[PDB]
């Protein structure tokens, strides 16, 4: 009637992704962790734009949408910043937002690539990922001689439930039972299917013998980071966020039980 005692085994850790395995947990816990990776791990992203001048060939909403999708390093700052809902300030303040400025003008004859390097921030900790000290800079717009783009953005705290720009992942590979032992899939021709990278089967064997007493355990994860957070920071923040969702739910539950 009590909690699982999950174990963890990290099989790869780079700056780009983290590949790990959780054992002795329920499939619902594993999938809620997977969902929180995508939808409830907050990060910083541009969510307010003011175009002072845009002579480029892309209209204002195009530039704004494009700026919103630039990942901003959010590692230690996202926990400190507040949601503008919770901030007791006006529209903005340094406690709930980060100011960016962009001011580019193509005066020379060659096309000027307005890239994420031109997004200048007031906060040194929250900068475009590509601008962080290889991979090139994200391209915001190409400008022709005489074209000019001057804007002022504000980045906010949010998560992927509100908009995919606050999603920190560039793909969450999730898998379990690589050999189809639980038979949660039913291959019409099991020989036709390639083997999982996590499979432990000799090549003559297509799928594992059916396990009637089996349950999903040993979930394999590959959490790729878009750049804002480190992959391990994505996983840790996901676990913390899920735990605080449950804690808030329990607080409200206690108020409802005692009020009855």
């Amino acid at each position: 009637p009590y909690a699982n005692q999950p174990t963890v085994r990290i099989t790869e850790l780079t700056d780009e992704n983290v590949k790990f395995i959780i054992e002795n947990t329920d499939l619902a816990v594993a999938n809620s962790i997977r969902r929180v990776f995508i939808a409830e791990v907050p990060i910083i992203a541009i969510d307010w734009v003011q175009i002072d001048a845009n002579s480029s060939v892309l209209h204002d909403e195009f530039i704004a949408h494009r700026l919103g999708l630039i990942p901003l390093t959010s590692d230690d700052i996202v926990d400190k910043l507040q949601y503008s809902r919770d901030c007791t300030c006006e529209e903005f303040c340094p406690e709930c937002s980060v100011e960016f400025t962009l001011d580019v003008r193509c005066n020379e004859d060659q096309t000027r690539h307005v890239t994420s390097r031109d997004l200048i921030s007031n906060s040194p900790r929250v900068i475009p990922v590509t601008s962080r000290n290889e991979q090139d800079d994200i391209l915001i717009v190409k400008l022709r001689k005489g074209q000019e783009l001057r804007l002022r953005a504000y980045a906010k705290k949010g998560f992927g439930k509100e908009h995919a720009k606050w999603n920190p992942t560039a793909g969450v590979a999730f898998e379990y039972d690589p050999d189809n032992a639980l038979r949660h899939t039913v291959y019409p021709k099991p020989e036709e299917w390639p083997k999982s990278e996590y499979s432990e089967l000799d090549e003559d064997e297509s799928q594992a013998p059916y396990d009637p007493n089996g349950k999903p355990e040993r979930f394999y994860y590959n959490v790729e980071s878009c750049g804002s957070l480190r992959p391990e920071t994505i996983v840790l923040s996901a676990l913390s966020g899920l735990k605080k969702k449950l804690s808030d739910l329990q607080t409200q539950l206690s108020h409802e039980i005692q009020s009855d």
Partner: protein, 67 residues
Amino acid sequence: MIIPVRCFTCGKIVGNKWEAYLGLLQAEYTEGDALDALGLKRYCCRRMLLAHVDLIEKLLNYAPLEK
């Protein structure tokens, strides 16, 4: 008109790969090998780079409204 920022499917950043992709293509890479060099392993991001039409280069053939 311009290379998207993220992959529509996964959300991987592809905005910083169009210029590198073109530079690899003029370096006599095949499109597949070029996409492998940029680290686009999921066929969604390969779709993003491989099916992109840079129309902004044609929109920059017109003089702007102000000099």
